[PDB]
Amino acid sequence: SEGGRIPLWIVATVAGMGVIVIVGLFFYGAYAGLGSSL
Amino acid sequence: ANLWERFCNWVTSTDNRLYVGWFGVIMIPTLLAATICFVIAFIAAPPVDIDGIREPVSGSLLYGNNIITGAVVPSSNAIGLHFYPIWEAASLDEWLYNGGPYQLIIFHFLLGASCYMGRQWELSYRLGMRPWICVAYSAPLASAFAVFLIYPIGQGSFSDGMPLGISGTFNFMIVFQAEHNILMHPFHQLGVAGVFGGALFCAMHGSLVTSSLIRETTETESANYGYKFGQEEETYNIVAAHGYFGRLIFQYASFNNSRSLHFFLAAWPVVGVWFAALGISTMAFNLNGFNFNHSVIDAKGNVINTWADIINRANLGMEVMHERNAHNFPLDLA
Amino acid sequence: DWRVLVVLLPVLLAAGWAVRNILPYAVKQV
Amino acid sequence: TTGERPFSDIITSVRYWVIHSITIPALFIAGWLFVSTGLAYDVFGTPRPDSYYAQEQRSIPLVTDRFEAKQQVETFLEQLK
Amino acid sequence: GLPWYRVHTVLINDPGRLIAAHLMHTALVAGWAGSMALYELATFDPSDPVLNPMWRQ
Amino acid sequence: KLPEAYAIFDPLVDVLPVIPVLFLALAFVWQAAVGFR
Amino acid sequence: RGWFDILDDWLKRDRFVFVGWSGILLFPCAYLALGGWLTGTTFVTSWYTHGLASSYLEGCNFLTVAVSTPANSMGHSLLLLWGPEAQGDFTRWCQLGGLWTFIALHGAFGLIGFMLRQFEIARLVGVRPYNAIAFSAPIAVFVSVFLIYPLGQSSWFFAPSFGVAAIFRFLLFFQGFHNWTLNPFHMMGVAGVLGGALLCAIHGATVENTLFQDGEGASTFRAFNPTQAEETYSMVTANRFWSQIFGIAFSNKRWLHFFMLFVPVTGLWMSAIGVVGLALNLRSYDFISQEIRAAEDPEFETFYTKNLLLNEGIRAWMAPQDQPHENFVFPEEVLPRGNAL
Amino acid sequence: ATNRDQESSGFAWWAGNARLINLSGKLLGAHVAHAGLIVFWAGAMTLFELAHFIPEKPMYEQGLILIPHIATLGWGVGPGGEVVDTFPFFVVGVVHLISSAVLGFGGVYHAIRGPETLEEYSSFFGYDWKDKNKMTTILGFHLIVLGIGALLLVAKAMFFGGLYDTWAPGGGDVRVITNPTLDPRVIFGYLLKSPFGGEGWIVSVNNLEDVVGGHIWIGLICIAGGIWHILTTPFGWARRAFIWSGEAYLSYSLGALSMMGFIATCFVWFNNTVYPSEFYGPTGPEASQAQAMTFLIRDQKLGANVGSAQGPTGLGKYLMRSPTGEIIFGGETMRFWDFRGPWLEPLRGPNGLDLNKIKNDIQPWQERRAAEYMTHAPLGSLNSVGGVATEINSVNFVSPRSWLATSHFVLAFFFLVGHLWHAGRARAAAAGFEKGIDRESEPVLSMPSLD
Amino acid sequence: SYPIFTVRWVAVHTLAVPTIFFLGAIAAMQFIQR
Ligand code: CLA
Ligand code: CLA
Ligand code: CLA
Ligand code: CLA
Ligand code: CLA
Ligand SMILES: CC1=C(/C=C/C(C)=C/C=C/C(C)=C/C=C/C=C(C)/C=C/C=C(C)/C=C/C2=C(C)CCCC2(C)C)C(C)(C)CCC1
Ligand SMILES: CC1=C(/C=C/C(C)=C/C=C/C(C)=C/C=C/C=C(C)/C=C/C=C(C)/C=C/C2=C(C)CCCC2(C)C)C(C)(C)CCC1
Ligand SMILES: CC1=C(/C=C/C(C)=C/C=C/C(C)=C/C=C/C=C(C)/C=C/C=C(C)/C=C/C2=C(C)CCCC2(C)C)C(C)(C)CCC1
Ligand SMILES: CC1=C(/C=C/C(C)=C/C=C/C(C)=C/C=C/C=C(C)/C=C/C=C(C)/C=C/C2=C(C)CCCC2(C)C)C(C)(C)CCC1
Ligand code: OEY
Ligand SMILES: [Ca+2]
Ligand SMILES: [Ca+2]
Ligand SMILES: [Cl-]
Ligand SMILES: [Cl-]
Ligand SMILES: [Mg+2]
């Protein structure tokens, strides 16, 4: 399919938010379960 | 022109071999004082009771030091953050016992260097330059402040300021690791990226430009003679350099803009070092490096060591040994 | 070992899928 | 340019996302399961939280012989009953 | 002129003088060996190969 | 803790202080949408 | 135009990522070194070699994960997957620290590959190979720290382990055991790196602040054409500025950029020489005069002797956990401690 | 879309807000909107704190920085700083939050709907940066507003509840300030104190009377200055000394804010009067002193003579002299002998720590306080593990004094950098070479050679 | 007009495929309990 259909700024925003999500998850893991010291 | 007008014009004159300027008016005497006092102290000062426990430490050459071991020793813990000028002492002998030279030097130097930065702004202005070299210089200067003024304020004594000496500098770093775990502080890490990275980009820029120099000389002469000071033509083919580097990695990882590239060259080490300075400056108030001591734990609850714990053991060594006669109570709270 | 087939089933399903979707252009290219 | 299609083109094409809205989550899930099934543990020889020590032991199973190291680790493992 | 770190490149197209420089280097190395041997002889104690062998000295 | 009646909004309240930061991120989204002209 | 030359044609095509003859060495070795590191730090323990957790799987974070060196008992074994130790077992191989030597060796050959790439590309584009040359310093450091140093010591165990915290420990160990900061080769290294960073900063800032106005914009980056002949900044104004600020200034651009190559490269090389020394315990640990005076005079104190007290603390307090193969048991009473702490 | 790309504005997207410099309406919007952000964070962060707040734990065990600020004003606390009613906190949050809607609204309006320039709309609200008069007038307005604020603190202290007084006789408590210090000798006396040890400049203020009086003085000074600037225009020497441009003004204010950030850092790090240790936890000096006190008490209970106990160095183990004679706590905390706090001062006589008082007069609440403060020293890690760098995980604690001090040193620093940046740029722009050197008019090329 | 399976394609995927798999793994790990 043709290149340019999906706006690069939307792709940027969504990819960004996903990065924030997974790193969020990892910092959540610092306080829960293994590696939490508790 | 009147006398003050003439004096003003000399001071701010763009023709002096070394620019004076109004910042220079403060810079020159303060730096001269700090310099003279430092040299005399480094050669001839008697032992200083750094930790205020009547355990005087010898920093000067005449009193048993070489270049590597020698130092102007920080003022006494008994003084804390008190202003200790020469006239507060009953005698120079006392002044020296209590580490007065150190305060005289670091204050005159801090003022003098701050004026060095200001003077960089000033000359830049007088020559019709853009003004931000002084901003680059703000990073090493802020570092200086961090280890000579701010950390002592946070910790409550100029006796914890960095010693003016090689081995004393290492003393400072080791004790800092003991108490703050600076290595695990993301700002010290950023600082390391600033200096390692700065060194990387220094070598890389230097090598690329050297690699693309335009042929202007013979093999029997130095290629440097192919550049003439003030020539309007650039002395290297930046297109060839960009072609090389871009193909070394991939095209869009490379700089085709010399201005963008040089701006990067300034910003990376400067920002990195800013974070190093802020690291020292905030560990000054005991916000320390990451503490993952005993963070991994097995199913029963046995501690499973990580590398962080071996770091912690090392820090403990430093901790228990440092200033071995100065602590009477179990918690080293400053 | 069932765990290897359970785990590496998504990967091979992705590969089969994209092969299905890119097959005509791949044949055209080759 | 060097002949390849721009990434700008590709990552904004509808087709790219048809393919990769499948293949990316597929992989992700595969890695997930690689952990959650416990497979990882056994592939790399990594201790589960209950397999670092036996119940009353507190001596690390340090490998101490070079050439019979394998039999040593196997013994260290059998020591967890 | 030639910079200091290039003064020896004058040998690149002169096999005679290159051989000569190499002869001088070989002379210096041999001379180092001889000199070093003499110094060790002037300082070596042969009286005890057991608790004072050459590698202790 | 909040007065009991507002307890319902506890999760919302756990999230509010971060909202300022979102604005900074938003500035970039907006900029991307006008191609950083 | 036979197979060799057709192959050469293909290798040197101008694609998005240049391959080259050097690509054959470089890409697989760099790939396996990076992949080895990611595999190891994600999944593999250090229980059986160091008694340490070192992976995401175990609960470590980015700062504490590592691919740790093998057990001291392994000596300087290449530790090949098919070698006498692992004997083909991938799991036992991981447990024995095979990944360390995997990463270090594929890594070294990768660095070779990368420098070969610098030569090759330089030769294709027609530039002088000074980037490769500059890259000899990274190579010297990697070979001296990761290969030579442990090869002098008892085993790979005492090489640096590939991880953030692990490297920090390497530093601290080097301070406590080698007094590395006292070493003039390390000091020259520090001068090279910090001098390098300084040159980076000051050169970039100087160029940026002696720019000619070449556009109307207040944001002045667009006022430069990559194909332009003229200097984009005023070397003459720069020279006067620094001459009046600092006393001396660059006047020659070629010398400036050569210097920028010279300082950090030289720095790293000196540091390498120092570490080659440390491989043999050939330390700059003490000043003998210092020790004679201090031993005879219990009122004689310097920052040199202070730092030694710190080192002694480090050794005593980190050795037992850091060197488990030695089975150190230091009773409480023998631990060096100052008052109270 | 006026001035909204690089081609028209001169400024790249990353310097985007520099496109607002002569667009008074839109810039008004940016400012009101930003104010909205600040009020938002205040309210929201307050409610967040309140939700996560267990009243029987000290605040400083709970990572609070705003509720402490509210309590210091005397709302919600009783004797000893014990939380007696959370509602005021609640109010303070909600109201702030509500306000941030209003502000936000205005911001957004002026930002993207309202007049882009204000001069063609209102001669009163419109301004030229170069217009020295109008500038000094707006400055004047805002000085009046500030004065009013300081006076509001005064009025809280004197007519509406009072303030929390850690020094209150018989124990910390909320107290009405009836006799504020009005003597200029005292008030400005503070201003002329050395910043060094045992002096501490304005950071040294240690009673609420001086604080209220100070704020009275500041209120009047600010209102009068405000009127003064509304009514006058800059004098000749002023005109000749300054750069009169938007960026220059920004640079001046940035320098001021740097100064203030450093000052606030020191304030929260050393002062325990306006930052009561009940709410903020002990200062560093405080906690170190507290350790000395704690072990003096212990060992003396065990039968030690703490006045004559000689330590390993030859200095007293518990008690020694300051360089001017005062009896002070021994060990490293000798550096902290300028510390003063309500739990320690009953043991202090004219020559310093009093030995008979130490032997006979130490109350259990003093032991308690010293233990608490010794065990909540402002030391801790970035992931909030309380204690020295070598302490094991267990205690979740970093002092609010640490948080506040470090945050504000960072912000003061970067703000100093920003003042250098914008001052230098303001100068170069005013002089007309901010974009670079004129090739055909390179000034250096017209200067005599240095040699 | 454009090819699909270039050298670049390969490089990209030899990096990207393992990366997403690995991130799935690490994700999973965040919910592991002692
Ligand atoms: C506090 C942060 C802040 C604020 C208040 C502003 C404000 C502004 N910016 Mg700046 N900017 C910022 C950060 C900020 N910016 C950052 C971080 C960057 C780097 C990405 C920039 C880069 C930048 C550039 C390149 C430009 C601006 C411009 C502007 C102005 C016009 C924007 C516009 O009309 O677009 C239109 C935007 C929209 C139509 C989208 C909607 C925007 C609104 C405000 C969102 C409202 C959301 C809010 C939650 C609603 C609450 C409503 C409720 C209260 C009732 C405006 C005054 C422009 C300018 O100066 O023009 C003269 C301009 O060209 N900015
Ligand atoms: C009241 C404070 C203030 C104000 C109103 C301004 C205003 C301005 N600045 Mg100045 N500046 C300031 C403080 C301020 N500055 C400080 C403290 C510094 C030192 C860092 C600077 C350093 C500086 C430089 C170097 C430049 C400016 C420039 C400008 C102009 C354009 C700014 C812009 O559009 O950026 C758009 C905004 C962005 C691109 C975003 C910035 C991103 C920051 C660095 C992120 C910070 C991290 C965040 C706080 C925490 C992480 C959050 C994240 C995880 C989500 C504008 C007049 C430009 C100029 O010269 O114009 C004439 C310019 O080149 N400023
Ligand atoms: C704070 C800075 C500020 C400034 C300088 C302005 C200035 C202006 N506004 Mg804007 N505005 C602001 C904030 C501001 N506004 C806020 C916060 C909102 C949301 C409520 C708005 C919503 C708004 C709208 C919808 C409109 C304006 C308009 C105007 C213009 C006409 C003003 C007028 O004649 O009113 C006359 C003044 C009065 C009738 C008296 C006001 C009574 C005040 C508010 C009582 C409270 C005073 C006290 C100091 C408030 C303290 C707040 C503090 C605690 C934060 C003028 C340029 C008009 C415009 O742009 O025309 C094209 C217009 O239509 N404003
Ligand atoms: C927001 C605060 C503020 C600002 C930005 C201004 C700005 C201005 N004032 Mg105003 N003023 C203010 C508040 C303010 N004022 C208040 C509250 C009052 C009532 C007290 C006044 C009373 C006043 C008068 C009587 C005059 C001004 C004047 C001015 C103009 C020139 C002043 C100057 O050059 O200062 C720079 C400061 C100096 C040159 C002082 C000497 C420099 C030494 C070295 C300062 C050292 C300070 C030291 C570092 C601080 C440490 C602490 C210290 C107390 C020990 C300038 C526009 C002048 C003017 O032109 O009016 C139209 C003028 O004559 N102001
Ligand atoms: C004055 C600033 C300030 C201070 C002193 C504090 C202090 C605190 N906060 Mg608060 N908070 C703040 C601002 C502040 N916060 C802001 C802006 C937000 C919105 C994001 C919040 C939202 C918030 C929440 C939701 C929570 C806290 C919590 C806390 C407590 C734990 C802190 C912690 O663990 O941080 C962790 C440390 C970091 C994340 C380090 C940040 C490093 C930054 C990004 C570097 C920035 C450098 C510079 C600005 C960049 C410039 C770029 C350069 C190139 C120029 C502590 C008392 C917690 C608490 O205990 O509540 C009771 C809590 O749950 N805060
Ligand atoms: C002529 C003749 C003769 C004689 C001869 C002779 C006598 C010779 C001698 C010779 C000699 C006698 C030689 C010597 C030489 C030496 C040398 C050549 C050396 C060098 C050295 C060096 C080079 C060193 C260096 C160093 C230093 C100083 C420090 C440390 C490091 C080093 C090691 C680097 C005869 C009769 C036989 C016969 C014929 C003729
Ligand atoms: C070893 C080995 C091998 C190999 C393997 C491989 C090859 C692998 C690869 C692998 C891989 C290849 C992996 C990857 C991974 C990745 C990841 C895991 C990532 C992550 C990321 C992140 C996490 C991010 C972060 C960040 C940053 C960095 C910055 C920005 C922001 C953020 C924060 C986001 C073989 C088989 C041959 C043999 C055996 C051995
Ligand atoms: C201009 C501009 C900008 C900015 C903007 C801004 C900054 C805005 C802001 C705005 C704002 C600043 C807003 C605010 C809002 C708020 C609100 C909307 C709120 C509401 C609230 C509420 C509704 C509450 C509720 C409650 C209650 C009442 C009770 C308690 C609980 C609760 C919380 C539930 C940007 C950068 C983007 C870009 C473009 C331009
Ligand atoms: C509230 C309060 C108080 C009080 C306060 C006050 C009363 C303050 C005042 C303050 C003040 C009253 C301040 C002032 C400041 C000033 C300044 C900071 C200045 C600045 C200046 C300048 C910056 C200038 C510069 C220049 C020069 C030097 C030369 C020429 C050029 C120019 C002009 C640029 C107290 C502590 C009692 C208590 C607490 C509370
Ligand atoms: O570190 Mn450890 O902590 Ca800052 O005080 Mn306490 O001992 Mn001492 O006097 Mn220099 O040094
Ligand atoms: Ca006016
Ligand atoms: Ca369990
Ligand atoms: Cl020490
Ligand atoms: Cl002590
Ligand atoms: Mg976890």
Structure tokens of H140?
Answer: 């004047």
| Contact by Cβ (8 Å): B119, B27 | yes
**Whether the Cβ atoms of residue G58 and residue G41 lie closer than 8 Å to each other:** no
Contact (Cβ atoms closer than 8 angstroms) between residue B146 and residue B281: yes
**How far is it, in rounded angstroms, from Cα G335 to Cα B78?**
29
Angle, vertex CA G56, rays to CA G54 and CA G57, nearest 5? 95
User: Which of H162, H79, H84, H154 has the alpha carbon at shortest distance from H342?
Assistant: H79
CA dist E6 and E9 (Å) reads 6
Rg of the Cα trace of chain A? 16
The closest-lying atom of ligand 2 relative to the alpha carbon of residue G218 is: 62
Q: Is the four-CA dihedral H155, H161, H165, H169 of positive or negative sign?
A: positive
Residue H322 has a CB neighbour count (10 Å cut-off) of 18
| Dihedral over Cα of G170, G171, G175, G180: its sign | positive
CA Rg, chain G, in Å? 26
Do residue G57 and residue I29 have CB atoms under 8 angstroms apart?
A: yes
Distances (CA, A) of H372 to H58, H71, H278, I20: 10, 20, 10, 49
Strands H319-321 and H327-329: antiparallel
Collect all residues with Cβ–Cβ distance below 8 Å to G208 and sequence separation of at least 6: B130, B132, B259, B262, B263, B266, G233
- Put simply, whether B39 touches A (Cβ < 8 Å) is no
Can you state the angle between helices A8-29 and I7-29, rounded to 10 degrees?
40
Q: Which residues surround ligand 14, an ion (CB under 5 A)?
A: B 327-329; H 331-332
For chain E, what is the total number of helices (H) and then of strands (E)? 1, 0
Minimal C-alpha gap between D14 and chain I (Å): 15
> E strand or H helix at H352, and its extent?
strand H352-353
Q: Hey, are the CB atoms on G59 and A30 less than 8 Å from each other? A: no
Sequence-separated contacts (24+) of G86-89 with Cβ below 8 Å: G86/D70, G87/D70, G89/D70
Name the residue type at position G29.
Answer: C
Strand H352-353 with B164-165, pairing = unpaired
| C 1-30 near I (Cβ less than 8 A) | 11, 22, 25-26, 29
- State the burial class of residue C17 (Cβ atoms within 10 Å of its Cβ: 0-12, 13-18, 19+): middle
**Rounded Cα distance, G255 and G243, in Å:** 16
Q: In the block, which residue shows the tokens 């953030």?
A: G164
Nearest-angstrom CA–CA distance, H178 and H212:
10
First to last CA, chain B: 58
Is the CB of residue G46 less than 8 Å from the CB of residue D60? no
Q: How long, in residues, is chain B?
A: 334
Number of Cβ within a 10 Å radius of residue G105: 19
User: What's the CATH architecture for H282-377?
Assistant: Orthogonal Bundle (1.10)
H380's enclosing H/E stretch is strand H380-381
Are G89 and D70 in contact by the 8 Å Cβ rule? The answer is yes
In H, minimum Cα distance to B230 occurs at H445
Cα separation of B222 and B234, whole Å? 18
Give backbone dihedrals phi and psi of H320, rounded to 5 degrees, phi first: -150, 180
Query: H386 - beta bridge partners?
Result: H380
Reduce the DSSP state of residue I5 to 3 states and report it: coil
User: Would the CA dihedral through E40, E46, E48, E53 be positive or negative?
Assistant: positive
Query: Which of B74, B67, B54, B80 is closest to B171 using CA atoms?
Result: B74
With CA atoms as reference, the chain D residue closest to G76 would be D66
Query: Measured on CA atoms in the order H430, H435, H439, H444, is the torsion positive or negative?
Result: positive
Strand, helix or coil for residue D81: coil
Nearest CA to ligand 7 atom 10: G35
Q: Is E16 annotated as a binding residue?
A: no
Question: Any alpha helices (H) in H208-354, and if so which ranges?
Answer: 208-231, 236-241, 246-270, 277-280, 284-301
B258 close contact with A: CB closer than 8 A: no
To what resolution in angstroms was this structure determined? Answer: 2.5
| Nearest CA-CA distance, residue H391 and chain A, Å | 13
CA distance G238 to G206: 7
Tokens at residue A36, please?
A: 């939490």
Q: Whats the size of chain G, residue-wise?
A: 341
- Distance in angstroms (rounded) separating the CA atoms of residues H164 and H216: 18
> Could you write out the DSSP letters of every residue in chain I?
---SS-HHHHHHHHHHHHHHHHHHHHHHHTT---
On whether the CB atoms of residues H353 and H347 are closer than 8 A, the answer is: yes
Nearest of G1, G316, G44 to residue G176 by alpha carbon: G316
Strand partners, H353: H348
User: What DSSP string runs through D11-32?
Assistant: TTSHHHHHHHHHHHHHHHHHHH
* Cβ of residue G165 closer than 8 Å to a chain A Cβ: no
Chain length of chain F: 37
Q: Which one-letter amino acid corresponds to residue H209?
A: E
- CB proximity list for A31: less than 8 A, separation 6 or greater: none
Instruction: Mention every residue, 6+ apart, whose C-beta is less than 8 A from residue B80.
Output: B156, B157, B158, B159, H197, H334, H335, H336, H337, H338
Terminal-to-terminal C-alpha distance of chain D: 63
Q: Using the Cα atoms of residue B58, residue B63, residue B64 and residue B69 in order, give the sign of their dihedral.
A: positive
Check if the beta carbon of residue B173 is closer than 8 Å to that of residue G238: no
CB pairs under 8 A between F and H: 40
Could you say which DSSP state residue G210 is in?
Answer: S
Strand H319-321 to H380-381 pairing: unpaired
Beta bridge partners of H320: H328
Q: Which one, of H43, H284, G199, H275, lies nearest residue B206 by Cα?
A: G199
Nearest to B293 by CA among G263, H124, H390, C2: H390
Longest dimension (CA), chain F: 50
Whether ligand 2 lies within 6 angstroms of the CB of H410 is answered as: no
Q: Are G69 and G100 in contact (CB under 8 A)?
A: yes
Chain F CB contacts of H90 under 8 Å are 2-3
Residues of D in contact with I4 (CB under 8 A): 5
Q: Give the E-state strand segments of H17-165 in sequence order.
A: 163-165
D31 contacts I23 by C-beta, under 8 angstroms: yes
**Range G285-318 burial, b when 16+ CB lie within 10 A, else e:** eebeebeeebeeeeebbbbbbbbbbbbebbbbbb
CA G41 to chain centre: 19
Structure tokens at B288: 């320390």
Mutate which: B297, B305, B307, B309, vs A, most A CBs within 10 A:
B297
Domain with CATH 1.10.10.670 in chain H: 282-377
Please state, in angstroms and rounded to a whole number, the distance separating the CA atoms of residues B85 and B107.
10
CA dihedral G215, G217, G221, G224 (to 10 degrees): -10
CA distance B303 to H199: 48
Domain of G145 in residue numbering reads as: 1-341
CB D16 within 8 A of CB D10: yes
Quick one: closest CA in B to E8, which residue? B220
Which backbone phi and psi does E2 adopt, to 5 degrees? -65, 135
Q: Are H243 and H426 in contact (CB under 8 A)?
A: yes
Q: Is H108 on the interface with F (CB under 8 A)?
A: no
Which tokens in the block code for residue G326? 């030695």
- Please state, in angstroms and as integers, the Cα–Cα distance from residue D19 to each residue in A12, C15, C16, following that order: 18, 10, 11
Task: Give the number of other CB atoms < 10 A from CB of residue G40.
Answer: 27
Give me the amino acid identity at H355: L
- Interatomic CA distance for residues I26 and G59, integer angstroms: 10
Structure determined by = X-ray
Q: At what angle do helices G164-173 and G303-322 cross, to 10 degrees?
A: 130
H333 CA to centre of own chain:
26
* H90 at interface of F, judged by CB pairs closer than 8 A: yes
Considering only CA atoms, give the Rg of chain I. Answer: 15
Of ligand 1's listed atoms, the one at least distance from the Cα of H105 is 54
Measured CA to CA, the distance from residue B308 to residue H144 in angstroms comes to 55
Q: Residue B164 pairs with which residues in a beta bridge? A: B72
Q: How many residues does chain I have?
A: 34
Closest CA to B328 of G305, H285, G336, H313: H313
For chain G, the domain total comes to: 1
SS3 content of chain F, % helix, strand, coil (to 5): 80, 0, 20
Supply G266's token pair: 């030289």
d(CA G41, CA G62): 9
Angle at G306 between CA G283 and CA G338, to 5 degrees: 120
Contact predicate B165/B71, CB 8 Å: yes
Mapped to the 3 state alphabet, what secondary structure does H300-336 carry? HHCCCCCCCCECCCCCECCEEECCCCCEEECCHHHHH
Q: d(Cα B23, Cα G297) in Å, to the nearest integer?
A: 48
Running DSSP on this structure, what letter comes out for residue G13?
-
Query: In the CATH scheme, what is the homologous superfamily, with its name and number, of domain D1-81?
Result: Photosystem II cytochrome b559, alpha subunit (1.20.5.860)
In contact, B133 and B19? CB cutoff 8 Å: no
Q: How far is I4 from chain C (nearest CA, A)?
A: 8
Ligand nearest to the CA of H238: 4
CB G103 within 8 A of CB G33: yes
CA pseudo-torsion sign G297, G301, G304, G306: positive
Tokens of B78: 């008994």
| In contact, H431 and H423? CB cutoff 8 Å | no
Query: Where does residue G331 fall: left (phi above 0), alpha (psi -120 to 50 degrees), or beta otherwise?
Result: beta
Torsions phi, psi for B15 (to 5 deg): -105, -10
